[PDB]
Design a protein around this nucleic acid. Structure first.
Lengths: 129, 173, 60, 227, 143, 93
RNA sequence: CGGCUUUUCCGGAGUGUAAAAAGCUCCGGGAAUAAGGGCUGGGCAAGGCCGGUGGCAGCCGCCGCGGUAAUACCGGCGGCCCGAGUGGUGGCCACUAUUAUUGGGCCUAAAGCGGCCGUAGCCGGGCCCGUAAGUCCCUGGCGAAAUCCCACGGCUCAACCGUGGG
């Protein structure tokens, strides 16, 4: 059973990247997935991404630019304050500011760097680098 | 609570590289025991840990602590007046050992040999800012460095002390 | 100390850089003859197609 | 320096080139070591690399990591053989590893040196530490992993002057590569120094593999090859 | 499969699992039950005082060969009798029947028997408040 | 050579506290009588009403620290001051 | 071989005692005038010769040496480490990702229940409206002192103690 669309999507993205496929289709096109896809695109990991009206859940189509070493979902959604970033960031980014974490906060799903700039906590949802 | 040693023993006592390096340092600077060297290295590690912790900290307290650390390090003379938080990781033990009382007085040419400097400091012939100090392991601040002179009542205040002309000749030679 | 920052080849079919000891291949474009395609071992073994940037010519 | 060019001249005057890579290094067309690496060519004449990298010939820059005595049993004796694990690398981000088989220790050492010469690789260096961030190639640019046998070694950037936080074998390997500080984390059997050295070599080689954006190059001051 | 549990709200099962499989360790199990403290003839004493009962030679384990001298000692603390090795060379002459000896551990693996000598656990340190090390060296003299 | 660094008058008690340095380079630590006789000169005090509490010789220092008091009437010390300090200063047998 | 200092010893003076005591600090006489413990085959790598014992005596944290030239026993010589300390024994932590949340395994090395159903528990499709309980930010009271860290200041420096911050 599909317990989670987001982790499956990120696993698919990484496995597609490793072989080197050009286009990736994400089957359970959820809103949180779309907000997620916006993020690393804003940071240049991917190119244009589009939604497709399939009539079941829609499908998210993305093209791969060969710039994603590994992407996954921090599953137990640990709540994190503003100061506790380096603790979790040391756990999921290979080096200092290498890659980005994604946080669901009061102001939306959005990048951990900008959250530090906004100085707002939230719940980690996924990591990619 | 009990007090604790201010020096950290090496993790393994019989590594050839560390053995030889410490032996070279011992012979050059002529400390009585490796205890003194280990104390100085522990001081170095303390400063480096403080720099490490501060470099990754954001907040007013972090800034104040950083400024204070740089101020003290400059006070010791271990850094230039335009030093930053980066080069502090590049400090070595030899920077500290250069700042020792014994090393400074010997570099001030009051001893033919730094062992003789250690004797002079122990016997109270060397005064810092007009105050004596009998610990050769004492660390000398930059400000103190110009006030280092012979003890007034000691015979070495006499220019005619028989060892004194030998000292000054070896300095000249 | 002048920095000898070279240009690391980047495989066209994927856009990845090529590791020093890979069995990649570089060759002039067989259609236009102007562009040199680089092709890394991962792309080569899987034989996923490459596209010329000049004339758009394509070929495994 | 001048001595190194002098030896380059001698080995140029003597070594007649055989492989295809030989001429455009004997003809002056190629001048950079990484000129070999970028095009995906192959090296089977060690004489090529020292012509570009005479610094290999230094005694300090060549290390002997392990001497082992392997015993092939036979119906009329325990015929033994020396396996020499050795590493040859310059202190500006190029290094190679090799294993030499010999009937004698000296010949084993020579063959290991030649094979380590032939397995030369380029390296990425930087300051990826969460603390240092000095933009100088003292450490790895970022965390990397190498695997071989049961050995998995994760190198993590470490602050300046920390000292190589790793076993002695990895200490020597990273010493000859021009890298100064690193945090290390090992899993599996580190006792078998051959597998451990191979795992460290794999990690250093994998350093190149990661995809990199132009911003992070300026961020970490990444050096690929010669600093 | 994947390691479980992993939910945000499964602290109880994680803690219970860890507690359950911590008992499978032997070091922690020994410490908590204080089994050594129940089994120790010394009852936790690194050093103990006893009275020699007899002298015995014991054969070392193969392939080693040798006749190791030792003494049976009746413990003053609790009365239980234990055998203790006599270190040094020819030390057995210095030791006599009904001698107040002081023994400690022998230092074998897990505090057990050391070297090739099996079953022994302790070595004699002092005799009649004079140490065996000097007596074998001869520097001091037994009372 | 005596250099006073503080003279506090305790109007409640009616006493002048005296805190001072004594320069004795190359010399022993001066005796109580000598310092008292030197102090009384430039401050014009009555020796009987003046008591010197302590004279501490700092290590490796040729300047010694000294603390004393100077009251107004002969009864104040008897009522207030510890009996032992006068015995040290000899004002009581 | 020559020259020199004063670690100690003697005397005085201060504090000192609410009393000596501390010999604490200053000055004076005067002298080269307090040093061991362990190891020396490898794991410890740190260190190589001589004589005795000869499957005995024995050593050994483990691997190992002794069955006659013993670099491993004993003794001498020499060497290495630490040092007013240095070894032996017992306990806790690390070593140890051999307790694994970070971060262990479960085909053949210890470990998948013989299988299936299902209660509790745990984990759960997408979109929109609502609450704002968890959550995140701000903010008031609170979490004794000492002890922790830092800068500055007092005891010669330090240890220790005070001031200010966290």
């Amino acid at each position: 059973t599909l317990l989670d669309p987001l982790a499956n999507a990120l696993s698919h993205i990484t496995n597609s990247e490793r072989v080197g496929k050009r286009e990736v289709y994400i089957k359970p096109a959820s809103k949180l997935i779309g907000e997620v896809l916006r993020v690393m695109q804003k940071y240049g990991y991917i190119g244009e991404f589009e939604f497709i009206d399939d009539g079941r859940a829609g499908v998210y189509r993305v093209q791969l630019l060969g710039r994603i070493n590994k992407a996954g979902a921090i599953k137990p959604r640990f709540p994190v304050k503003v100061s506790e970033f380096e603790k979790w960031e040391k756990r999921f980014l290979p080096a200092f500011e290498f890659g980005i974490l994604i946080v669901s906060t009061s102001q939306g799903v959005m990048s951990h760097k900008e959250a530090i700039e906004k100085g707002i906590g939230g719940r980690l949802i996924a990591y990619v680098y | 609570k009990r007090q604790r040693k201010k020096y950290e023993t090496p993790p393994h006592p019989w590594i050839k590289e560390r053995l030889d390096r410490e032996r070279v340092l011992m012979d050059k600077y002529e400390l009585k025991n490796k205890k003194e060297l280990w104390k100085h290295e522990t001081q170095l590690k303390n400063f480096r840990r403080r720099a490490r912790r501060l470099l990754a900290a954001r907040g007013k307290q972090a800034e104040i602590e950083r400024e204070q650390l740089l101020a003290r390090l400059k006070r010791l003379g271990l850094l230039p007046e335009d030093a930053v938080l980066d080069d502090v990781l590049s400090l070595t033990i030899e920077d500290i050992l250069e700042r020792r009382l014994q090393t400074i007085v010997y570099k001030k040419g009051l001893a033919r040999t730094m062992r003789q400097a250690r004797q002079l400091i122990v016997h109270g012939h060397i005064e810092v800012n007009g105050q004596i100090i009998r610990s050769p392991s004492y660390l000398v601040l930059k400000e103190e460095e110009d006030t280092i002179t012979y003890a007034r009542t000691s015979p070495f205040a006499n220019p005619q002390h028989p060892e004194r002309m030998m000292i000054e000749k070896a300095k000249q030679g | 100390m002048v920095e000898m920052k070279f240009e690391i080849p980047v495989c066209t079919s994927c856009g990845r850089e090529i590791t020093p000891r890979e069995h990649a291949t570089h060759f002039i474009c067989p259609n236009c003859g102007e562009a040199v395609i680089w092709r890394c071992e991962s792309c080569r073994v899987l034989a996923k197609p490459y596209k010329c940037p000049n004339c758009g010519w394509e070929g495994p | 320096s001048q001595e190194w060019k002098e030896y380059a001249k001698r080995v140029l005057d003597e070594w007649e080139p055989k492989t295809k890579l030989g001429m455009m290094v004997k003809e002056g067309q190629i001048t950079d070591i990484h000129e070999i690496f970028r095009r995906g060519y192959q090296i089977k004449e060690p004489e090529i690399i020292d012509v570009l990298l005479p610094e290999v010939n230094a005694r300090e820059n060549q290390e002997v990591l392990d001497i082992a005595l392997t015993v092939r049993m036979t119906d009329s004796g325990r015929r033994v053989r020396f396996r020499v694990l050795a590493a040859v690398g310059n202190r500006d981000g190029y290094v190679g590893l090799g294993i030499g088989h010999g009937k004698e220790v000296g010949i084993a050492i020579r063959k290991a040196i030649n094979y380590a010469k032939l397995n030369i690789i380029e390296i990425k260096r930087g300051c990826g530490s969460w603390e240092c961030r000095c933009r100088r190639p003292h450490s790895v640019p970022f965390a990397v992993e190498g695997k071989e046998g049961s050995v998995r070694v994760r190198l993590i950037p470490g602050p300046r002057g920390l000292g190589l936080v790793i076993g002695d074998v990895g200490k020597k390997i990273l010493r000859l590569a021009g890298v100064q500080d690193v945090w290390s984390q090992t899993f599996g059997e580190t006792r078998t120094t051959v597998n451990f050295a191979k795992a460290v070599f794999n990690a250093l080689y994998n350093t190149n593999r990661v995809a990199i954006s132009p911003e992070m190059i300026e961020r970490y001051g990444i050096v690929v090859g010669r600093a | 499969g994947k390691k479980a549990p992993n939910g945000e709200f499964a602290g109880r099962k994680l803690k219970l699992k860890r507690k359950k499989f911590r008992w499978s360790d032997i070091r922690y199990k020994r410490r908590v039950l204080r089994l050594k403290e129940k089994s120790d003839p010394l009852e936790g004493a690194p050093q103990a005082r006893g009275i020699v009962l007899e002298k015995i030679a014991v054969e070392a384990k193969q392939p080693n060969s040798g006749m190791r001298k030792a003494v049976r000692v009746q413990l003053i603390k609790n009365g239980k009798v234990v055998t203790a090795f006599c270190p040094g060379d020819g030390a057995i002459k210095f030791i006599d029947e009904h001698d107040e000896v002081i023994i400690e551990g022998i230092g074998g693996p897990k505090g057990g028997s050391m070297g090739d000598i099996p079953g022994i656990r302790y070595k004699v340190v002092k005799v009649n408040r004079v140490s065996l090390k000097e007596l074998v060296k001869g520097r001091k003299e037994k009372p | 050579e005596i250099r006073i660094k503080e003279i506090k008058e305790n109007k409640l008690i009616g006493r002048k506290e005296i805190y001072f340095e004594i320069y004795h380079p190359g010399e022993p630590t001066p005796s109580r009588k000598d310092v008292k006789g030197k102090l009384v000169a430039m401050l014009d005090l009555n020796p009987e009403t003046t008591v010197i509490q302590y004279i501490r010789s700092y290590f490796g220092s040729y300047i010694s620290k000294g603390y004393a008091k100077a009251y107004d009437s002969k009864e104040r010390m008897l009522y207030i001051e510890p009996e032992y300090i006068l015995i040290r200063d000899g004002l009581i047998e």
